[PDB]
Nucleic acid binder design. Structure first.
Length: 92
RNA sequence: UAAUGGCGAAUGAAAAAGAAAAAGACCAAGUUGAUA
RNA sequence: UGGAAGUAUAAAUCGAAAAGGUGAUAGUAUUCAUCAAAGUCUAAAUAUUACAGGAAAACUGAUAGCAAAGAAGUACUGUGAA
RNA sequence: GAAUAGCAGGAAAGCUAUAACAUGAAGAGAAAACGAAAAACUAUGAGAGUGUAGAAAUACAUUUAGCAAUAGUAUCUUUCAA
RNA sequence: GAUUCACGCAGUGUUAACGUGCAAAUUACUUGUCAUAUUUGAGUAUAGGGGCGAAAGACUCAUCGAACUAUCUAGUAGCUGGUUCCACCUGAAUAUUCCCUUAGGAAGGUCAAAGUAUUAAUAGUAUUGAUUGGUAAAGAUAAUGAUUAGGUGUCAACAUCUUGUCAAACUAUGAAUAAACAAAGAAGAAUUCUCAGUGUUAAAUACACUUCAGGAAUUUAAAUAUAAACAUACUUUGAAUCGGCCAAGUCUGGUAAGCAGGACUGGCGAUGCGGGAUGAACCGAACGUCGAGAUAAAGUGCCAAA
RNA sequence: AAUCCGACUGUUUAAUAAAAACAUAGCAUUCUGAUAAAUCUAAAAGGUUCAUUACAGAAUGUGAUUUCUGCCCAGUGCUCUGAAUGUCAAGGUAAUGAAAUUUACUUAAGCGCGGGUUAACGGCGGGAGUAACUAUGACUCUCUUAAGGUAGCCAAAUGCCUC
RNA sequence: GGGAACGGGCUUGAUUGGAACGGCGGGGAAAGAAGACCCUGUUGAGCUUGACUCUAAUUUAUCAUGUGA
RNA sequence: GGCGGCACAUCUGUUACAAGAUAACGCAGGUGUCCAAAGAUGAACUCAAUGAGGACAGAAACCUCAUGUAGAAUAUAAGGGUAUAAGUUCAUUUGAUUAUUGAUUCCAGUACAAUCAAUAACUCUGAAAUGAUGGCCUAACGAUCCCUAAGAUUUUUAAUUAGAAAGAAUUUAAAACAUAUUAGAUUUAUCUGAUGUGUGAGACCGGUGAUUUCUAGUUAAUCCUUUAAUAAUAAGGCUUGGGGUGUCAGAAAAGUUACCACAGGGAUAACUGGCUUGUGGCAGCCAAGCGCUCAUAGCGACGUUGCUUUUUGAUCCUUCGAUGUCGGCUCUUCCUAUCCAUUUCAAGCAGAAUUGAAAAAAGGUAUGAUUGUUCACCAUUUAAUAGGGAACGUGAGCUGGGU
RNA sequence: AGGUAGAUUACCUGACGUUCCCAUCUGUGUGAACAUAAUGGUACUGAUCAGGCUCUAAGCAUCUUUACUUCCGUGUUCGGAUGGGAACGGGUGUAUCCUACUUGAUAUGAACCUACC
RNA sequence: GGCCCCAUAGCUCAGGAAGAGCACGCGACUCUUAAUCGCGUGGCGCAGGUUCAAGUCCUGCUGGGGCCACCA
RNA sequence: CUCUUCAUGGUGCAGCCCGUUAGCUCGUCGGGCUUUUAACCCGAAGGUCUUCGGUUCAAAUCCGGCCGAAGAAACCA
RNA sequence: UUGAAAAAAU
RNA sequence: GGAGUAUGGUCACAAGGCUGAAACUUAAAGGAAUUGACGGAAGGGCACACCAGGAGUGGAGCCUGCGGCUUAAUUUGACUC
RNA sequence: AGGGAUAAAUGAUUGGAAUUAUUUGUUUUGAACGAGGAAUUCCUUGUAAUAUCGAGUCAUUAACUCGAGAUGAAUACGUCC
């Protein structure tokens, strides 16, 4: 929902409680050279039409939120998953 | 078996190693031109 | 295709060489290893349910064994393939 | 009776072949890289004796034994993790 | 591309005949039509996701909402039918989990056959002891609600004392039946002496665990009833099955149902015999082949034994 | 003597439907200058209309004659002699890197915007106020989505209620 | 009567002489046909459509070097 | 079956039967969220309501005292829990974190998910004991493959210095050419021959020693792989989250067939039959009244008890390798809950015409317009023109009007 | 006798009144500093002038409540079992188990460690 | 049968702390009328249940309207 | 998912892609013109320019998530 | 450029 | 007036043409000229009618009259120049 | 310090009677109004405009009317819009 930045939490690398900078994780752009996409592009070549299933029955209206609690002095990130929330904001 | 596959159903070789039999020869290109 | 950033063939375009190919994870570089493509022929070891000639059989013994143990692909059916 | 090579006999049968390999003797890890003893411990448990007695059968007491099996232990190999 | 008759043709009606017919579409009368959008022979052209169609999915060799014929092909079927000698022994299921699952499958339960272990490894039972529950019941100014009135105190109202009747989604109290323990297995008890390693601790000689650490002596087979050695504990492999139905000193939906669905048990299914005349379930009682005897349910005027 | 359908002659489900069904002439619409339009074929100096040439060829709806064909271009089709950087591919160019790669700019048709089109597919409702008996509304504002059933016709082979 | 709730067979009764001819149409839940109405199959086929995935024909851009501005 | 609904994943009370399990398209409701505080901790206070008082101020504003077992509040549905709190107010803070075990709940004793008990860190609050790994508890959710993020500096090594200790190391036939010197040629990114040499060499004589340890520094690399060796890009590994399947153990999916086809089914509908009789028909009991007087000549309200299968329902037991599915015509038979004729009783029965009831089913109970109609409504005639059953009698008896 | 800490958590609670303080406890005085809030009312701290006035503790009452006992009553209900009775509905007999509400009698606390009177 | 809704002056319709028009009567205006204006009469279907207060929230009853239904 | 666009009184349309304090009509009230009515004219009220930030001397107006609609294109858990 | 209308008998 | 309408006949493809009533209703309908009034008809003059201007009023406070509202009554006449 | 509205104290005149203040004196109170929209009035020379004086009403009461003088514009000598 509303979670402020600058959270002070335990950092495994430094083995200490250091101030962390909190952000929100977003899925990165899909690479065109990974094994799964490389294999898929080969399958789609040639005749036969669509060769792999296409999902068309979405039911979830929300998604789980993953933060990036990042070390401010050692750059050690942590991924923490929150519950499903409809509206999420990063507070002050 | 390695691998391939809505990596699902399924498909799937080869070097090595052991035997049968064993055998290598030519064109073109290059050279020789009282040239055949 | 087992060959997975392409194992092989073909088509469109492109297209080498004071050579070069391969070492299957794409790329550049330096070494190493091993061959030298884009012409041709080549016996022996292997396959065989055409067909012909033979020999065998824990095979069948006339509703069985070939569809057919007699003028059997015959009698008979169909316009015809059958 | 892996192909395969010999023997007598003439044999789809029989016999002989220091033999590649298959399973197994060592296990864990994706992989690199590794690779097992405190010559074990505890508990209950199979068998064998001796004596006395009922007295025909056999039962009571004592000495010894530790197998199989189950369970738990220390130790050791591999794994982020047994 | 007028009206009619005739040779012919068609197929309006009888919904006549026939309907194992003359005929795998015919016959009789009746009706319509009977030359120019006419009738007809032969030749020739058009071929299967094709042809041809004044259009009915009509016709394409008795085959058409996609011909015939041969191969793939013994296509696939969770669906239907059938599945072949005798005797003997043991003998089921309709729970649970998952499935594009509901006419079907896999884990699991019931069951069979093989193979074991002297075996801390017996109980669909009763008694004694300490417990758990909130059902039947009961209560109704005892908590939450429902509801009939009568007094007393300051029309009504609000207090307070009585009265009548209630609750599956109310409760103080609370059975009967039940559920889970104990009634002596580190191997059948107890006591005395000795006693170690860790740790708790303020430190411990307390305490905790260590085969009631360990070790040695003495005593000892005791500690509810009943039953149980072809007992008990299993191990492995695997078949069939998960459409069920019935009864009730039971329940829920429904007016009710030989209706629909559940808790506990016993049955039919898988089951014959004696009785209820006949009946899957009711009553007695479960079955190798017989002889004799008392019996069961139930019967004793005749059918019919008494 | 009347009513319904079809205008007429004609054709049709060989073997349960011969008819109001099909055809028909009449009316109307669309495309095409022939190297075209339609359209068969895998391909082809290949093939059909076509030995043809707009009084023609090809593709459709309605069905003689008479009378009349109302209003709507919002949506979906079709079309345009229309506008441009709304969105749109491989490619092309350029930058970085050792190179693959990565990044950026540009590029056609198509759709979207704008106009036309209903004898193109189709649609033709609702609310409020109003005439001197009541009633209705000739008349005015008006929302969806563009217009709100016109001329006619009717318990119709079309009307539940309905005998 | 009970039974699978409409028996020719079973139980209890009514009743029966063996063989049959011509009719007729009550029954034999008469014959003809692995229901065609309905449902179930993770069985099909014709037809339709911006159902999903594709494809012929149509169309557009780039490539494929004729000479001179 | 369809349409409707989700009993498909799921929570609360009840059905439900005082252990556990537990049915219906049973009943009353609920979920796909919300929260940087509504998490954690410490402190203080006590809520709803009632009584008595105080200007506006009243039934409801704010203040004070007394009583006040929660009758308030606790994000939500319901049920549980809670008073020096779990409620309200204030203050600090992020434990809503990392790593490893062993259990409990559905359980097949699988996964997911949830519920716990500890250990090793680093922290929050408090003086402290303690408490803290999200929300007081029971719902608030998700596989293989794919994609996308986070993590593997702890340690182990190689080379070189200083010191220390153990150390023969296997044994005769040789080709690449890094180089040099010459021989024959070419001008070009210039080559082709032949002879020395080392390389590339290895057979040590109790001591030398090539070679591996240990200690102290320095330097470089340090999660694994791309299989001849490295490098920097790229890709693949290993662990943990996110992107989702709501048909919730998780295919990628529109209709119509009346032209339809196949395997099957009474596991399952349309017709009879069977159980039931709400509904339809008929019949009773009581007596408030009507009937000018008079409850019962004739009716009988409010209540209440039955019979019938002639209507329609409810169920799905028989029939799906077929029981010919409406009506009419013809014909026979049966029931009485009787319409007429026959014999009787009663009246608010003078006669006539009637009305209520008993015996009795041997006899009779019609003709037509409209409709396929059963039904209906008309016009007549008659002593009367009654009501029903027989597989809703009757299609190898007819018709084919309806469906 | 009193005070601190408790364990059982109403025989301990609630209402109307009553009895002492000799020690202790309490109420009581004050606000400079620690510290406290709008208020020295709370909490905090400093003290001892007075008081048993309330607390607290001990007792009273046909006291509500609460805890034991008989009775209610072998009454309601219940396990087993008929070819027992009834058209149903419901209700016996047999061998068994046996509540609750109510009313009546009794009680109104017992008990542990430390200090001081 | 089920479901949705409505019930208010003499008439047609509005409304948690009883109205609009039509109807009648009175008055203003005019020389007199017709129109027009102002004012007054003219009453929530019934019975409970919560609230300090209901036409206004809910339940039961009465009356009146429109709407759903395929193969056999 | 990518690109692009729009949102303003009760209503519909304006507005400056730099900016300095927002208008035109219908709708309401009142007044004016007319002998009177209808048309006609005028004034007032009516939004502060969707919601939060930055952008400065100030934002409907320049830029960002957020709202809530529209157009084109794409889709392996 | 726009300019519609004025109830009946007296 | 009804009415060139209904009906009858006839001509035309049709629109329509030719012939052609009655019922009923009503004291006027109409013709030419006169005078007046009016004209978003022409011609000629005039007026603070306008033009060129001044002061203004309309905006504000107050005085005053009218309407409306109110009230026991707010007495009433006059409503374009 | 323009403006003098609305109010609060107080002093007198007229009146038989002053309250809803008759008129007025002293002090204090210090409001709108920053030149005025559409419309619209009056005016051509001692005229408009500006400020004042007398009289009618009158016990007391002018911001009214009828007259009187005091300063002294601009713009026309025109046309029917």
């Amino acid at each position: 929902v509303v979670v402020p930045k600058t959270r002070k939490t335990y950092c495994p690398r430094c083995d200490k409680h250091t101030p962390h900078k909190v952000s929100q994780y977003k899925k990165g752009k899909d690479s065109l050279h990974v094994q799964g996409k490389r294999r898929y592009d080969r399958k789609q070549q040639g005749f036969g039409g669509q060769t792999k299933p296409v999902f068309k029955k979405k039911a979830k209206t929300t998604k789980k939120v993953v933060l990036k609690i990042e070390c401010t002095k050692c750059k050690y990130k942590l991924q923490k998953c929150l519950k499903r929330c409809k509206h999420f904001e990063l507070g002050n």
